[PDB]
């Protein structure tokens, strides 16, 4: 809206969604992003509309996706995804904390921005090197942290359902029988 481009809230919701899907990305280092945005014109791209107009989107590409890491920009009180992950892993029993550091899986369609894999690693490493192991930068090598994110992130809910129905296709205890609700009306499985 702050460039001379007026899109109403209701009827143009699905027109700006294509702009978000096509041209948006999360920056690794904010500094180089701003340096390229201020002293260089290689971030501006032209998008065509159904009406035939051509609009230009510039430095707004890497500002919209950063409500996730800094939630206060759109009036949401909290800590952000990177710090909330830290507060969740550092709230369980000590023995199983290593079992969760190594295996973090990303799912859903709102984690397909370019660079979102490569930013959470840096944020967790910095948040775990100034809160838990303050200073003494030698033991981080022994501390292994790994994030798994295959290029099939969107449909991982479906694919899991494609496996669990395949293994347990035959034995008739996994399903809730029709006759169970003819007499009982509830379930315990």
């Amino acid at each position: 809206l702050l460039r001379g481009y007026a899109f109403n809230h209701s009827a143009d919701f699905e027109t700006v969604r294509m702009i978000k899907e096509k041209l948006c990305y999360v920056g690794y280092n904010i500094e180089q992003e701003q340096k390229l945005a201020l002293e260089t014109t290689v971030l501006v791209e032209s998008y065509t509309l159904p009406d035939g107009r051509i609009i230009k989107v510039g430095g707004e590409r890497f500002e919209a996706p950063e409500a996730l890491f800094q939630p206060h920009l759109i009036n949401v009180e909290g800590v952000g995804v990177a710090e909330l992950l830290f507060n969740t892993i550092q709230a369980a029993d000590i023995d199983t904390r290593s079992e969760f550091y190594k295996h973090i899986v990303l799912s859903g369609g709102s984690t397909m921005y370019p660079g979102l894999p490569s930013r959470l690693e840096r944020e967790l490493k910095q948040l775990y090197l100034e809160r838990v192991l303050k200073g003494d930068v030698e033991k981080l090598s022994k501390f292994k942290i790994r994030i798994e994110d295959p290029p099939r992130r969107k449909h991982m809910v479906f694919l899991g359902g494609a496996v669990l129905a395949d293994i347990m296709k035959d034995k008739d205890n996994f399903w809730m029988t029709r006759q169970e609700y003819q007499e009982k009306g509830v379930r315990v499985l």
């Binding site: 990305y25 002293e39 260089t40 290689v42 501006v44 510039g58 370019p114 660079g115 490569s118």
Partner: protein
Amino acid sequence: ATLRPYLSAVRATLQAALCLENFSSQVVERHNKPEVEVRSSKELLLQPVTISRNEKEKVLIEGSINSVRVSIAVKQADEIEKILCHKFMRFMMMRAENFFILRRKPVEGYDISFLITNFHTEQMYKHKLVDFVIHFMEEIDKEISEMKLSVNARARIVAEEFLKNF
């Protein structure tokens, strides 16, 4: 005479540097950025090259695997040429979203500076960009040398009309 070999040398050096390809970043996943602004791998950069005619007019060319940077400094004779050159470059740099191949702020020590990416080499031909740069380096000198005589010729009529009455 003397400008023609200079333009010929700049033409020859530009033709050997605009041979670009596509390259995704090998530091952050799925970011396509130029590899001459974002300097993150020494292997992908080429040696800079400078070509000059006298002690105050020279062109610097910096190559890479998917971007070329070309910085040009122009001639200046007296104060009026100096300030008109500065005004003209500031005029062009303000309108940089329409000039697709123009950098917003120049490299220090140089007046004007272009940045050409592989996208601008696929959406346009190759020899016409070099011809555009060669046109750029001479048409500006013509334009400012004309503007000087234009301003000089605007004082005669004003002085004559004021002195005519009384």
